[PDB]
């Protein structure tokens, strides 16, 4: 931790003495006798367990619609909207995702 001297006001660093170590400083004569036990306990931040990302569980969060996809004739599919600048004028595009045994991703 941070410990200062009461006389001068500077900091102290532990050094070796004659028989045992002592708290001394290089600014003014001041020695403190080391006693039975002084101890500082710290609690470093531990790490947690990581989660598995991806899967249909997270895909159920986003809501889907009813539009057929011409790959396997399956009506269930996810639709999203996006803004894109075309060559002539602004144009809103839709991203299509097939929620089936094939699972394709299209952009029309």
């Amino acid at each position: 931790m941070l410990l200062f001297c009461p006389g001068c006001g500077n900091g102290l660093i532990v050094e070796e003495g004659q028989r045992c170590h002592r708290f001394s400083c290089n600014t003014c004569p001041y020695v403190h006798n080391i006693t039975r036990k002084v101890t500082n306990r710290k609690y470093p931040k531990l790490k947690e367990v990581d989660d598995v990302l991806g899967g249909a569980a997270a895909w159920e969060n986003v809501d889907s619609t009813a539009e057929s996809c011409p790959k396997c004739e399956h009506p269930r599919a996810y639709f999203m909207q996006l803004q894109t600048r075309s060559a002539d004028e602004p144009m809103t595009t839709f991203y299509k995702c097939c929620n089936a045994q094939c699972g394709h991703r299209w952009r029309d």
Partner: protein
């Protein structure tokens, strides 16, 4: 072929059709706030509850 202000107009049955949807949306949205406050929304993907 022409367009006017009559083509784009709210329908009679359309005003109350979206009103109930907006009301249900707000009624579902003002509950997740207190759910987050007291502690709820068990998140499956690794992320922040916010």
């Amino acid at each position: 072929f022409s367009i006017g202000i009559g083509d784009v107009t709210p329908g009679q049955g359309l005003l109350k059709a979206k009103y109930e949807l907006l009301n249900a949306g707000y009624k579902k949205c003002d509950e997740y706030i207190e759910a987050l406050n007291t502690g709820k929304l068990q998140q499956q993907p690794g992320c922040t509850a916010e």
